[PDB]
Symmetry: D2
Subunit: 242 residues, 4 copies
Amino acid sequence: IVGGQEAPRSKWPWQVSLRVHGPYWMHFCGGSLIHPQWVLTAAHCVGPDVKDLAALRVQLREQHLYYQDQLLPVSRIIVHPQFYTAQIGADIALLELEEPVKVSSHVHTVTLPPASETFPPGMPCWVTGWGDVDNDERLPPPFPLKQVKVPIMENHICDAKYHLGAYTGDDVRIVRDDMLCAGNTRRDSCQGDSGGPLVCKVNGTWLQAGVVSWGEGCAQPNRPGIYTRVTYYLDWIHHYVP
Amino acid sequence: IVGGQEAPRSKWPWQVSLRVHGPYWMHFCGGSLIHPQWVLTAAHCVGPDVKDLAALRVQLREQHLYYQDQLLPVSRIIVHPQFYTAQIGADIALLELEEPVKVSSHVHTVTLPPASETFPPGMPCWVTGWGDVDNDERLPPPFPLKQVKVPIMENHICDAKYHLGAYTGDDVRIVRDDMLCAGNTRRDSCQGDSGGPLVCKVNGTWLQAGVVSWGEGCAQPNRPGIYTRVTYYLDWIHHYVP
Amino acid sequence: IVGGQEAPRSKWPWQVSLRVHGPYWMHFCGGSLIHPQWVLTAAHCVGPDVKDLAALRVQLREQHLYYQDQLLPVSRIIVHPQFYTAQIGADIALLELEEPVKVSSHVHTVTLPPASETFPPGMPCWVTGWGDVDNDERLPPPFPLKQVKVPIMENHICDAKYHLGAYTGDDVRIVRDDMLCAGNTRRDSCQGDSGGPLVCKVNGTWLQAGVVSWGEGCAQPNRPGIYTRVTYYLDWIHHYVP
Amino acid sequence: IVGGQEAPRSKWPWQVSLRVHGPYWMHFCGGSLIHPQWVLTAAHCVGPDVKDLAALRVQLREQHLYYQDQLLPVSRIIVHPQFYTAQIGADIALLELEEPVKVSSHVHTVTLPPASETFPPGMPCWVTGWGDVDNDERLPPPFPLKQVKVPIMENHICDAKYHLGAYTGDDVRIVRDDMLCAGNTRRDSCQGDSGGPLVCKVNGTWLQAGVVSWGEGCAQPNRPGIYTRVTYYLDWIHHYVP
Ligand SMILES: NCc1cccc(C2CCN(C(=O)c3ccc(C#Cc4ccccc4F)o3)CC2)c1
Ligand SMILES: NCc1cccc(C2CCN(C(=O)c3ccc(C#Cc4ccccc4F)o3)CC2)c1
Ligand SMILES: NCc1cccc(C2CCN(C(=O)c3ccc(C#Cc4ccccc4F)o3)CC2)c1
Ligand SMILES: NCc1cccc(C2CCN(C(=O)c3ccc(C#Cc4ccccc4F)o3)CC2)c1
């Protein structure tokens, strides 16, 4: 997370940490609890290559990474079949926990948006995670969960920004319809926030608008953060999630 | 270049080295002389972002990188407008030298293939460059130009190979029609060879079949080297090159 | 700490962490509370060059580094005047805290040994710290305080061990009288443990026998851990510490 | 080498490169040809630990490192028996080549100084090598042999300089009698120059005053380059070299 601050303990109960086996269970991506037994994440965190289920653990909301770990095994990794790169799209995946979680006030699910949902240019949206604090700048220990309010940038506006200082023809779509933009040069998601949530408050309800996917660097001029647009994958999510 | 050997001094007269300004004019990509004033390379070497022309130099065929440098300025960088990532495709670019080169026996152009040329399996093809000798293994000093004979793999066989050990749906094309596959677990191109040529001997004539583009690592099981298919961009090349 | 385990919360109340100002107050050396207002450490942690007092903080006993920091400023850094490198010796320093600490059961001083105490082989001795778990292997997050029981080696034997597989003449003393040896190929102190304590239980009292100083790597054959022998510097320590 | 320039082809015929076996025969230290079958170097380049003779090669004068390698095996590594660290001293070693070299105008021996030879300030002295061009700044390819004219500083003035901004007592000798100082903030030897020569022109004859040994960084204020004083080891050199 670029800019913003350490999240209050009561905020973002759906935030999860994805862990890889090694010298320690290291954080590699974020995610969100969307059902007591399901985690929503980015496909690029777990693919396109198939990896061993035993080498993965899920960690529920934690104020400080690694401090009070209670690691959860995964029974299934479901990666969107259209996925191979974040720039092509379909950067979405589902993790089925071996067991459902005991939902509380401090740890509970995020609401997915309705199929119609549009996120207008400049809505109140927040991105959260334990990712880098800037380009090649790690989140320092004790690794607090960070948050940052990010402005929505309309797809066409965002796509035109990606063409500034680039050779790509104006007629060539970089920001696809299954993608969403948010952030600026002071507020953004970064490496390590991938797979984590972009939540917008709509009519007093927090809705997950996006999944942290890609971009050119973090908080770079004319390069807003690119998110997987959740509404585009609602049917695919609902085929697996009750 | 993974496998193969140091190229004889009389071989590959069209091979060029792309140099970036810094503590020294460092090699970052390969290229090929296709006309006395034109270099063919990969778009990912010079894009998608526009960089300063002054920060780039072209070095003609050199036995050992850096030892007998005679650097050449560039007046134009022409990147295919469809390009943004090597995985999407259109990974091709043209560099116009400020001045034409004095063509000789040791330094001369490569022949582009006719539109009809397919390059089927069994064809004798060679990849050249000063790139990595294996994954995260730099070409050691004195940096000799290397070559490796690589087997051609049918696009469909290659696409199926890229689906092995991956979540990507079989109906999702990874290796596109504008791409070409070459290499195996002992013979391949690697980081630093990008932009360079894949040449095939057809009826006693060396034809540039491909441009080193991408792949998953270097000489990895079920991951052949992926090349930009030159024949697909002949009309675009001919719009700029006489 | 090589080998051993995470220390119980009730053990080693005198253990301190030395912190350097940067992106975060990073651990760089250990130390020990020898008086409510004095920290004993290694001179190589703070010298031979004079550094800014404002760039240093002391952290009292912490179960997990960085997680519950209450940083303490220093008013004086007193480095043994004989010191320039750990291999020559006099690798000892004193830090005067700006304020005395409120001593409790969980955080209190270690006892210095009497001048007569030699610590022969067979003495139960423990070395503690947040240093590397092996050669070029950092202590993983959440960074627990580790301990390891180490066997003492009599000086002349340790000096002769340092000559094995080395060109240094047998008559040339490597391990000096102001030094103490402890550890083997499974149990040792390592980078980041420097300045921290080696404590031995003598007549039901924990005495600080040494200060983690140097060695050739960590737990390497014929290279035991070298400590500054506390008894040798008692007069110098008493010139500053009540 | 910090400052100075690329050496002319006719200069420093005695300069050698020490090579270690790995992905390539990599330069790790310099040396000097003092006899057709003997190389003078620093003990720290080859010790204090004993390494395999097969893992070492000597490369004679080369304008550009790695370009025209003709590596030479070594039959004996003789390290001064007083050596363990460069800060203590006796940082000198001898390499006996398996075969003598065919001496020419481009490749020949350096003259050792007479025992009476003091090299006072004002004497024209050069240090040569393929080492770093500054602190953490590698010599760029094609790796030319560099030279730098360095001012001699008297030992007591140099000793006092090493005490500036350090805790070490003024009565504690850092720069020993078996050492020699040269260089300033614009001229110095650096990592990779170690073992190489410091030569002074005395009565039309080039004499090797020193062996690159140590210092605190490269071209740092109040930290001149420290050399092993050759005159101090003439008897030891003469035990082995005719
Ligand atoms: N700040 C949002 C965000 C969140 C998580 C991870 C990242 C990564 C994604 C990959 N990274 C890249 O630099 C990267 C990979 C591909 C591209 C291009 C691009 C681009 C730029 C101009 C025009 C067209 C393009 F495709 O950028 C590192 C940052 C970025
Ligand atoms: N061996 C030929 C070659 C020549 C030059 C440069 C490379 C690079 C290209 C980028 N690299 C990658 O590892 C890379 C970037 C994107 C992918 C995927 C993939 C993939 C795997 C299974 C299914 C679908 C995929 F897109 O791999 C490093 C090697 C490779
Ligand atoms: N296990 C003890 C320990 C505790 C804290 C920090 C270290 C460092 C000290 C410096 N290191 C070295 O490898 C080092 C620095 C100098 C020497 C030599 C030596 C030597 C070997 C044979 C004979 C004489 C010697 F002085 O080794 C890395 C670990 C080692
Ligand atoms: N003069 C340039 C030069 C040439 C060859 C090799 C080096 C090395 C020697 C080791 N290095 C150090 O930084 C180093 C190692 C030990 C010391 C201290 C010291 C010191 C400083 C003040 C007082 C007393 C000291 F012993 O410095 C890096 C470069 C430096």
